[PDB]
Amino acid sequence: GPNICTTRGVSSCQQCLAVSPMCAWCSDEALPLGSPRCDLKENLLKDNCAPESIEFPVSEARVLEDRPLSDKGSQVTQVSPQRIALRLRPDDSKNFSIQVRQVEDYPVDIYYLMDLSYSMKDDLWSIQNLGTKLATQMRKLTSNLRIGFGAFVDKPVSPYMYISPPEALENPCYDMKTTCLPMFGYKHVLTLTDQVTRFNEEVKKQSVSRNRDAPEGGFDAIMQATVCDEKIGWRNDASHLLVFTTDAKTHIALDGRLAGIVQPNDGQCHVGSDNHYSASTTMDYPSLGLMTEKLSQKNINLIFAVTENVVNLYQNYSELIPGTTVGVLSMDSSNVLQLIVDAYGKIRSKVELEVRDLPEELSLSFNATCLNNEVIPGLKSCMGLKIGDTVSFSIEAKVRGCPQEKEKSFTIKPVGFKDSLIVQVTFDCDCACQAQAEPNSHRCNNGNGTFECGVCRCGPGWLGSQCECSEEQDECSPREGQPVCSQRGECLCGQCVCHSSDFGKITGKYCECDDFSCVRYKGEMCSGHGQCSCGDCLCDSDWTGYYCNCTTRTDTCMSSNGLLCSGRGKCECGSCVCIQPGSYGDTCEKCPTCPDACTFKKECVECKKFDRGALHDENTCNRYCRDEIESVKELKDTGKDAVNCTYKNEDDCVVRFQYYEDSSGKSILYVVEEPE
Amino acid sequence: LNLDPVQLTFYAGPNGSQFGFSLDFHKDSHGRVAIVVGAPRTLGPSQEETGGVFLCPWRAEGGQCPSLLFDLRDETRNVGSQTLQTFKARQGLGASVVSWSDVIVACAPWQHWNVLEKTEEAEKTPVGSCFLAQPESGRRAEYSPCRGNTLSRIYVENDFSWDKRYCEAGFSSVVTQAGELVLGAPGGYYFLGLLAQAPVADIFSSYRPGILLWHVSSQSLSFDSSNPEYFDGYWGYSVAVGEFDGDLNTTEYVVGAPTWSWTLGAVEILDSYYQRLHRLRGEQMASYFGHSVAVTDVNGDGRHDLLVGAPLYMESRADRKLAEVGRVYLFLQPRGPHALGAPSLLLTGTQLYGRFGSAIAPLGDLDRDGYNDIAVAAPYGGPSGRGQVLVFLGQSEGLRSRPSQVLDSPFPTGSAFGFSLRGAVDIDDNGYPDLIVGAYGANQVAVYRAQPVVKASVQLLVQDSLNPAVKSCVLPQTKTPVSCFNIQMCVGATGHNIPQKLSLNAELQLDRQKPRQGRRVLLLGSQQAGTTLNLDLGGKHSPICHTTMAFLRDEADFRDKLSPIVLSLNVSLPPTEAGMAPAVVLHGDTHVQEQTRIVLDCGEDDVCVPQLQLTASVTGSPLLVGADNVLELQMDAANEGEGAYEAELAVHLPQGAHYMRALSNVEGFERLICNQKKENETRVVLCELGNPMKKNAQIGIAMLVSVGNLEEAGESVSFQLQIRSKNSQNPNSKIVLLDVPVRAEAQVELRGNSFPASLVVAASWGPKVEHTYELHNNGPGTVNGLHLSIHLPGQSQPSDLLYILDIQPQGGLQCFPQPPVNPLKVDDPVLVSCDSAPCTVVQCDLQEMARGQRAMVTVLAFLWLPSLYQRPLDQFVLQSHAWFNVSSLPYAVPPLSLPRGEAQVWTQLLRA
Numbered sequence A: 001g002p003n004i005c006t007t008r009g010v011s012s013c014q015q016c017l018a019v020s021p022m023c024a025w026c027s028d029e030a031l032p033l034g035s036p037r038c039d040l041k042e043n044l045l046k047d048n049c050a051p052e053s054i055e056f057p058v059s060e061a062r063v064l065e066d067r068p069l070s071d072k073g074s075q076v077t078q079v080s081p082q083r084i085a086l087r088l089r090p091d092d093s094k095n096f097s098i099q100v101r102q103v104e105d106y107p108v109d110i111y112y113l114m115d116l117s118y119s120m121k122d123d124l125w126s127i128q129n130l131g132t133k134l135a136t137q138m139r140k141l142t143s144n145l146r147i148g149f150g151a152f153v154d155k156p157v158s159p160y161m162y163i164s165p166p167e168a169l170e171n172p173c174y175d176m177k178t179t180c181l182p183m184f185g186y187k188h189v190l191t192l193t194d195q196v197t198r199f200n201e202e203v204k205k206q207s208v209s210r211n212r213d214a215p216e217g218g219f220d221a222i223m224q225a226t227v228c229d230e231k232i233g234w235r236n237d238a239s240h241l242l243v244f245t246t247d248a249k250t251h252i253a254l255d256g257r258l259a260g261i262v263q264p265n266d267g268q269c270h271v272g273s274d275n276h277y278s279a280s281t282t283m284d285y286p287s288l289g290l291m292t293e294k295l296s297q298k299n300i301n302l303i304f305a306v307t308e309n310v311v312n313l314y315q316n317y318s319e320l321i322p323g324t325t326v327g328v329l330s331m332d333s334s335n336v337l338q339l340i341v342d343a344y345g346k347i348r349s350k351v352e353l354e355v356r357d358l359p360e361e362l363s364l365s366f367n368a369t370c371l372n373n374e375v376i377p378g379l380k381s382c383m384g385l386k387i388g389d390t391v392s393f394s395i396e397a398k399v400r401g402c403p404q405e406k407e408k409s410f411t412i413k414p415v416g417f418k419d420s421l422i423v424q425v426t427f428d429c430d431c432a433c434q435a436q437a438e439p440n441s442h443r444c445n446n447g448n449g450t451f452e453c454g455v456c457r458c459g460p461g462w463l464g465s466q467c468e469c470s471e472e473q474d475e476c477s478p479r480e481g482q483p484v485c486s487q488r489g490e491c492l493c494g495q496c497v498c499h500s501s502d503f504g505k506i507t508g509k510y511c512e513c514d515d516f517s518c519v520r521y522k523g524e525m526c527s528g529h530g531q532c533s534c535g536d537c538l539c540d541s542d543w544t545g546y547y548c549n550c551t552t553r554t555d556t557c558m559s560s561n562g563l564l565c566s567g568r569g570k571c572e573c574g575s576c577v578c579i580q581p582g583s584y585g586d587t588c589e590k591c592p593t594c595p596d597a598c599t600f601k602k603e604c605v606e607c608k609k610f611d612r613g614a615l616h617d618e619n620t621c622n623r624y625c626r627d628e629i630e631s632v633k634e635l636k637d638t639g640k641d642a643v644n645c646t647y648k649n650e651d652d653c654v655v656r657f658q659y660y661e662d663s664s665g666k667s668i669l670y671v672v673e674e675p676e
Numbered sequence B: 001l002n003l004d005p006v007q008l009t010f011y012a013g014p015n016g017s018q019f020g021f022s023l024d025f026h027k028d029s030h031g032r033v034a035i036v037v038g039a040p041r042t043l044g045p046s047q048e049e050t051g052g053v054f055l056c057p058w059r060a061e062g063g064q065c066p067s068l069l070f071d072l073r074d075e076t077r078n079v080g081s082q083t084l085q086t087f088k089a090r091q092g093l094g095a096s097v098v099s100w101s102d103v104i105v106a107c108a109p110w111q112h113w114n115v116l117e118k119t120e121e122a123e124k125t126p127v128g129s130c131f132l133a134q135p136e137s138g139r140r141a142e143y144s145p146c147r148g149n150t151l152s153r154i155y156v157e158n159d160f161s162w163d164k165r166y167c168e169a170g171f172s173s174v175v176t177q178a179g180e181l182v183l184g185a186p187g188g189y190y191f192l193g194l195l196a197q198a199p200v201a202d203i204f205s206s207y208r209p210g211i212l213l214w215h216v217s218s219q220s221l222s223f224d225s226s227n228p229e230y231f232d233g234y235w236g237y238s239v240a241v242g243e244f245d246g247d248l249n250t251t252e253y254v255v256g257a258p259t260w261s262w263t264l265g266a267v268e269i270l271d272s273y274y275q276r277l278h279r280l281r282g283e284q285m286a287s288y289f290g291h292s293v294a295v296t297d298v299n300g301d302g303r304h305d306l307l308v309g310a311p312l313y314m315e316s317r318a319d320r321k322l323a324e325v326g327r328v329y330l331f332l333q334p335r336g337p338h339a340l341g342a343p344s345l346l347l348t349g350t351q352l353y354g355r356f357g358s359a360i361a362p363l364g365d366l367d368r369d370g371y372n373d374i375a376v377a378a379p380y381g382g383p384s385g386r387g388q389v390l391v392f393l394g395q396s397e398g399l400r401s402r403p404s405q406v407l408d409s410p411f412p413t414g415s416a417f418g419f420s421l422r423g424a425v426d427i428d429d430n431g432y433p434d435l436i437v438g439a440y441g442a443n444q445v446a447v448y449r450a451q452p453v454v455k456a457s458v459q460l461l462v463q464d465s466l467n468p469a470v471k472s473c474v475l476p477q478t479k480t481p482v483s484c485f486n487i488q489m490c491v492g493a494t495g496h497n498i499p500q501k502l503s504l505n506a507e508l509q510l511d512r513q514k515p516r517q518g519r520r521v522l523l524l525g526s527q528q529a530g531t532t533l534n535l536d537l538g539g540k541h542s543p544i545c546h547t548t549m550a551f552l553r554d555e556a557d558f559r560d561k562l563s564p565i566v567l568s569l570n571v572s573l574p575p576t577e578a579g580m581a582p583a584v585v586l587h588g589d590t591h592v593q594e595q596t597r598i599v600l601d602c603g604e605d606d607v608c609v610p611q612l613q614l615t616a617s618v619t620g621s622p623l624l625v626g627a628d629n630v631l632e633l634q635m636d637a638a639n640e641g642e643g644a645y646e647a648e649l650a651v652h653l654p655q656g657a658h659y660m661r662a663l664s665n666v667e668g669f670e671r672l673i674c675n676q677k678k679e680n681e682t683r684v685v686l687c688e689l690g691n692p693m694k695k696n697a698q699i700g701i702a703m704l705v706s707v708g709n710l711e712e713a714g715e716s717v718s719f720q721l722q723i724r725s726k727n728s729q730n731p732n733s734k735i736v737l738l739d740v741p742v743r744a745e746a747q748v749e750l751r752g753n754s755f756p757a758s759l760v761v762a763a764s765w766g767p768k769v770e771h772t773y774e775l776h777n778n779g780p781g782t783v784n785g786l787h788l789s790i791h792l793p794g795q796s797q798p799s800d801l802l803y804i805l806d807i808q809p810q811g812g813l814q815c816f817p818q819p820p821v822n823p824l825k826v827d828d829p830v831l832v833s834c835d836s837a838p839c840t841v842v843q844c845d846l847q848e849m850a851r852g853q854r855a856m857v858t859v860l861a862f863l864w865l866p867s868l869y870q871r872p873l874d875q876f877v878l879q880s881h882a883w884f885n886v887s888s889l890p891y892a893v894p895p896l897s898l899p900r901g902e903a904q905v906w907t908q909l910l911r912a
Ligand SMILES: *[C@@H]1O[C@H](CO)[C@@H](O[C@@H]2O[C@H](CO)[C@@H](O[C@@H]3O[C@H](CO)[C@@H](O)[C@H](O)[C@@H]3O)[C@H](O)[C@H]2NC(C)=O)[C@H](O)[C@H]1NC(C)=O
Pocket: A312, A313, A316, B261, B262
């Protein structure tokens, strides 16, 4: 029976195992010439092939380390399996389950940056007691906490500060009656310490400086806090938090030209033995990509803390820098505590997986499956997690060809967490009859050819096990009307030798299927995200759709309610399309004609309790019914902050409940227990 | 394109220094041309880095530079009580070196001046300066336009404003060709920005050596502003001159503002009196939109086209979400005072942290093609990370997104190669505007020399078909029966200033796509695959055509007689000369492929005259403009005559059309239907059959037409179909023209409902009731003069069951009720209709509505307790209807239907 194994691979065992996983090769030299060598295993068995000549290569996702994920972070592994001896074959993919899981009691590193310009004085006088009030809270969320302190103003150089009289070179603060400290760019103060009181001791002795222009030099301080791993005191098995407070704009790169400071920031850290950013007056400000990659590599989490006067700027920033959270800081600065706790709750909630050192020929399609069984296709991150929760993923890697490097590796890692998966990738591209080749076999035209895997390699224009024929006649095409060898070969002795091609090689039993002739999307072969299959685009692992236009993007599809395109709408190519008429918004969340929470979201009383109705044979019964089911019994709160509602059931009974919104949305039910 | 990177000569200058950082082509004492290269931090008089300005001449040896001498020797005086001194230490003289016809205007943007208020002080604030030294000596006179004294507190104004100490004059300047001088000062009015202007003819006059305070009567500075957008905008970071917004004599300004609107940044266009004309907003936050502003005519229309740099631009990719690759915007100038909207195109570098867009220097017609070309430098680009310079070439649409040429940094890591560029002036009278690139980290300046360019033109001429029966030649030295046929080649190269000794190696290959034992055609004499011919193109632009004598091999030599014969042509310059530096740089088309076949399948009459027959039809005649149109045009191609070679259909599609796929008399496909008419020539890019068409063969092709967003298609579009073949006599069939009309009827759907529909009774003003009516032209076609008529039972009287409180129409729709609603705020069912009872018709009119727009109108009302309690055992049904219509469509004759519709609203009452 002709199949893909038959009409395509008629050259070698290697191609037979490269086409499809099912394809099997027989190396028995006594097999009659004409029968398909690469075919179904049962077919080869039916042709009494030698069992040692039967080739049955199978890929595997073999786990080397499967250590249990710990209960407490007191090594503690969050990612299982720890290390994968992945083994892949050409143009094949393989799947495997990874259970990322945020262990409670993970150590926390906090480095409290701080601005020190002239407008920062009151906030300093308020933050003098910060740090014991941060530990007092964080003792609930982790067992090991270490805090650090910093400072920054701007580049110590004209025109950015006041320098006259020549006695104001030391004191830019003379024109006003009070005096304040000189120029300085960044000065590390305290290294991350277990004794939290050290931060309180260190901040008291600091004092405000003065500059001229409103923006300040914070980016230099952040980069230096990041890069001096040894100086700061970073842990490796902990959570790194970087708190960055200010109350005005912040200078960016190339702003330093106004002083003649033109050397771009090298990314190294120049904090000498005096803890002062030495190259402050000779090195430019830091870009935004250097910032991001240095925060990534050191597993650093950034928490901005602007004053409303600027949030819209910073939140317009913490969005071009993943892993970042912005906040409102009061002018007195008495809210940075609760801001930092909320930011810690937020950073741990989101659970995203990043892939590093992934070779170009490999593509990974994720397929989340967060809490419940939401096998949410095309998703690689989950929200709404709680500390102690476990998640699972279905990640599948597809290789494009058999790469020259036998052993390659890449890492899949949770955001800002130590433990991560190391992938040992092996490209198996070796047969068994290859090792027992017989070069210069006398049967190959008196001994001028090499015999291997049941074929004598005759010279050009000659074919067969003995090169019996050169010129001549058999049927070289599947159909009479079809051209001989698909206009691509010669009917040489009943076999179609494909013509030479500059671009590559022509394959197939009759030179029928090519390899470089597929369609495009945007000037790119199958959108640059697919692979060429005899006239049709086939996508890679993480490319969905027929045209391979779009990957597992969801960021714009994510809705603040907690699902893709809110309820109505498919997330096609990272964008949400409204399906319900009259509904609009970022994810079609706003709908004036749509039923309210009291009308449509009653299936908690129908699907969760007294299971009946629709959505019973599908995984959507508790998909929408996942709110807090409070067991209230007709409380005397029939409408004070929301709209109270009551409906009539089939048996003429009333059920009273009320939940509209408390703080930007609350999935809390107030359904009564016993209906009346 | 040329920018020879093998001899980048080096004007090496004082070791330390930053020799570089700024430069400009300037004249000599008697005509001629030299090079003025800035060099901060050089030649300290008392060993403090003052930063002299060098005057490097032109020489290929790349020596050191003579100096333009200034009075770098301090100046000091006092009028009556102000001991003012202009401190001269730690400034970057040469940071801008802009010149004029006989005047060097080299500036020292961080120069000082200390406005003490006698005992009190207001600081040595960098007032900048511009040391206007005249070459040929003469008055070496200096004028810092911000040198107006102050007693500090008087003109702090108590606003901190109306005072302009920190100008940093010289941070940018372009001597206007009229004879003025602008001195962009990013520190004007507390860093908000400045722009000081002054004539150059009179400025030399108004100098008193030794004087510290004096203001020229002809100064004109930008006015302080209080808009919190501008606050610390660094306005005037970089300036330019250009006839942008139609102010010819009051020639505009292109004042940059790379950090405006809270780091968004902007590039503003202003007149001579500092009045804005447009404003270009930055696309990405913190991307530094406007670091380097270049004004040039890329599209070759006569209108100056703005180019804006965003050096810290970060891009999002599948494999990398945040990658600093830089971005350069382009804004083409539309006719009239039309506003500059979205960026016309975006250029983008590939190297990480390359700071792409950090310096844009209009190179002029670098390849002399009629379109201006620019240079965008990457200080930290290149695979190694030492720096790159990427050159882009302009065209009618704008700039091609891929760099035509790229230069790698020859100086080591840290050299900041490419920080500053210049163009527009040939440095050696070679006919091409060279480029002079600074590397301030390496204290050197490497100049790249544009070499004369040739335009490659490739053309391979072969006979239309091959007839085995015609054997009029013989194979030399043998007797092979050859179907000989002549093949001609033609390649020309034009250009300006081409060297008088220029030659090319014309190589032609026969039987290309086929191997040694699969060749069908060879050279008669040498019996070889091909040969190379010599051409002398030195000083001659017309092409050279040579014809080769090609033959057909024997029938028994090879078996394949049906596979097509494919030929490929290549043209390349002779091998590089000693010392590298190729005399020219080759660009344009380089590879061309042509194919022919043997006369076959024309019958038995030897007269192969095809008769291709095509039938066409139109589906989906009403074309909604920019809709989800699914059009499957079906045509059948038949050859009632004889064999047609490479006969394929060429169809001209509009700009908005896209190909989704398709089968056809395929049985060979369903996803592939190609299309010819692709950009220039390529009038064959479509699929083949001509391969060839068998006699009486009948293949019908079905392909999908997806009408995309095309609002500029016009009143109609025309589709042209004709089968194109390689034949000479009757090459194509009869022309099939399909004028598929675009007569656009937009579908507008009227909807309406009551909120709540039902009304239950629980156990003084009642709850409010909302009636929702939504208007949305889901039909993508545009409608003008849309009319909405609201018909309601009664006249909104209090005697009715419902009392209308107010009508709140949003979405830009205006309604006119009669009689007007809300005369008072207050707080067997009978069919009462609009026609029977007196009616209050509310008419809403829309002059113009865009595609996909939506409208929303909210109706406010309240319940009546006395009326509700009446008839407790009676059921009340409330009915309201809405009607709408479209008066006409903006088309001559769309005789299908005037869009209209209606809505129904139902309200019921229940008993508890
Ligand atoms: C952070 O970014 C957001 C988004 O860019 C900024 O707000 C939005 O900015 C756009 C661009 O101007 C505004 O569009 C404008 O709308 C007005 C009419 O509303 C129109 O006249 C303008 O021509 C333009 O089309 C958009 O309205 C605006 N939206 C908001 C929420 O303000 C935001 O300001 C940025 N934060 C800051 C202050 O840097």
